[PDB]
Design a protein around this ligand. Sequence first.
Ligand SMILES: *[C@@H]1O[C@H](CO)[C@@H](O[C@@H]2O[C@H](CO)[C@@H](O[C@@H]3O[C@H](CO)[C@@H](O)[C@H](O)[C@@H]3O[C@@H]3OC[C@@H](O)[C@H](O)[C@H]3O)[C@H](O)[C@H]2NC(C)=O)[C@H](O[C@@H]2O[C@@H](C)[C@@H](O)[C@@H](O)[C@@H]2O)[C@H]1NC(C)=O
Ligand SMILES: *[C@@H]1O[C@H](CO)[C@@H](O[C@@H]2O[C@H](CO)[C@@H](O)[C@H](O)[C@H]2NC(C)=O)[C@H](O)[C@H]1NC(C)=O
Ligand SMILES: CC(=O)N[C@@H]1[C@@H](O)[C@@H](O)[C@@H](CO)O[C@@H]1O
Ligand SMILES: *[C@@H]1O[C@H](CO)[C@@H](O)[C@H](O)[C@H]1NC(C)=O
Lengths: 261, 247
Amino acid sequence: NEQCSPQQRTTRISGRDGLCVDVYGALTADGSRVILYPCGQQQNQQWTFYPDNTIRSLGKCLATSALSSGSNVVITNCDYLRYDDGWMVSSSGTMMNKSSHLVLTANAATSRTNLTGENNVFAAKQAWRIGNYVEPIVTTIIGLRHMCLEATDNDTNVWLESCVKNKTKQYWALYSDDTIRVNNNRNLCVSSSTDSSSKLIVIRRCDGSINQRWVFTPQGTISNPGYEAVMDVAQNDVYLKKIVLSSATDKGNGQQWTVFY
Amino acid sequence: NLSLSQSNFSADTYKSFIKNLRKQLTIGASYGSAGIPILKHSVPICERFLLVDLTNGDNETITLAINVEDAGFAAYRAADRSYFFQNAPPIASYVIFTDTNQNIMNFNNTFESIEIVGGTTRSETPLGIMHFEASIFHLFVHDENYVPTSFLVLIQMVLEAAKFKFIEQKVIHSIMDMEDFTPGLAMLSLEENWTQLSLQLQASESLNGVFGDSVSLYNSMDEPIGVDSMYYPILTANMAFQLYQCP
Ligand SMILES: *[C@@H]1O[C@H](CO)[C@@H](O[C@@H]2O[C@H](CO)[C@@H](O[C@@H]3O[C@H](CO)[C@@H](O)[C@H](O)[C@@H]3O[C@@H]3OC[C@@H](O)[C@H](O)[C@H]3O)[C@H](O)[C@H]2NC(C)=O)[C@H](O[C@@H]2O[C@@H](C)[C@@H](O)[C@@H](O)[C@@H]2O)[C@H]1NC(C)=O
Ligand SMILES: *[C@@H]1O[C@H](CO)[C@@H](O[C@@H]2O[C@H](CO)[C@@H](O)[C@H](O)[C@H]2NC(C)=O)[C@H](O)[C@H]1NC(C)=O
Ligand SMILES: CC(=O)N[C@@H]1[C@@H](O)[C@@H](O)[C@@H](CO)O[C@@H]1O
Ligand SMILES: *[C@@H]1O[C@H](CO)[C@@H](O)[C@H](O)[C@H]1NC(C)=O
């Protein structure tokens, strides 16, 4: 089966706020930097993946420009990296330089932002959807007692309510930076607690933080990888109207969720 | 045998049955990067079937043989009778429903084959609590005119729901709202692409989670979403097991 071994694939890469990984001004010179830009069809936003662990646009290779955190990611001549073991991408969407462990990061949301190689802290600024379909995915999130997650208290809290197909606030936009955004206000993100005394999960203004990165795992959890925790229904009681971040456990069903799109 | 009966058909019971089915199917499964379990393969025929019992509104029961390599129905038993698809593994009749009157259904267990012979498609076939109950009856008596369409119901409500949480969920909404549905493009996309998505997931191992080819999955707005990589929650948090495809 030769389809077990695909030779290459050209795709896009989206991430923070649904912007795309883009070679600034389609410049081809070695060390020409990479930025967030609004997604389109241009060749400078087209990234070809190969078995050699290279990722390429404009015939040149995506790469970090320094061992230390904080320097730009760039395209450079692929012949420079012939002795390098290249890039690695986790299930979560963390794109990591295999050698240095630095990760593709966007230190601001704003278009034309320089992408840098930073230390992985599992922040939403560091999550990426490799794929041509860069749009947010609109859906309901269904958990304990077949109930839906709903944005409440003027989009500040979140908890389970009975699923109603019409209900506007039960819809969520799954962005390419692993954020889970309020559907009709996509500046707001689902957020683990910022107050140390609370485990309550809430809704806040999207900031690219660790609190705001969520991974829908195949085992049916919504994981916050940075905090090594998962979304849970407080006391397995939907009527408490509290969703909290907990250590993965198989005690109840409160940590199990389904995406319905 | 794992079981689902009409007398106790509730969202919770359905969800348990599907859950126990998945895990029963994934005993000794292999695992990739993606963490989606891959069904067993080159299994000895003696061990390749999982039996499941379905009991209808009358107190009457069928036992269905699921091929554990591909989560399809191979055959079923009603009382002292049993019925095999043409494309059941050729030795299957010597392993399952041994002590019964064995009949060959003159069609394959595939949707295409079932739809051609029954003259009726999935899109026009209702799914729901009472259809499932009736599909069990028609199989029990083996009303030839209703066998195909019955399989369309039951394959989808049992096996395809086990494959895809979306589909499971689609059946749960139906049980709770007490409303029948016919499968839209969303459901069909999944059913259509299970084997292809299995292949691309396993092939993507060597392209950093990127597929060799794209797969179009519809949402409930009929907008096609292209899945060309493992980084889509509508795949990763949906499809519960894969067909063995690649080493
Ligand atoms: C996103 O990336 C670009 C590309 O790196 C950033 O801009 C560059 O900014 C450098 C400062 O970080 C410029 O270097 C300067 O060059 C002058 C020449 O006289 C020199 O006097 C300065 O000391 C400085 O020196 C560098 O010194 C170290 C050397 O290794 C290096 O070769 C020198 O250049 C650099 O020219 C410029 N590169 C290009 C091609 O644009 C960009 O930084 C932002 O814009 C630049 C132009 C500058 O005005 C910065 O103040 C500003 O941050 C960065 N974008 C952001 C917003 O962070
Ligand atoms: C990943 O990071 C490593 C280390 O920062 C890079 O390896 C360096 O490559 C540069 C340019 O080719 C050389 O000048 C250095 O000597 C290398 N350093 C080490 C420690 O090997 C590597 O290029 C990066 N690769 C990618 C794909 O980003
Ligand atoms: C088509 C083309 O080259 N477009 C690029 C765009 O992708 C982005 O890099 C921009 C930066 O200001 O420069 C150009 O407009
Ligand atoms: C059934 O499938 C077999 C392969 O097992 C095949 O060669 C045949 O064409 C199919 N028959 C029908 C009626 O669809």
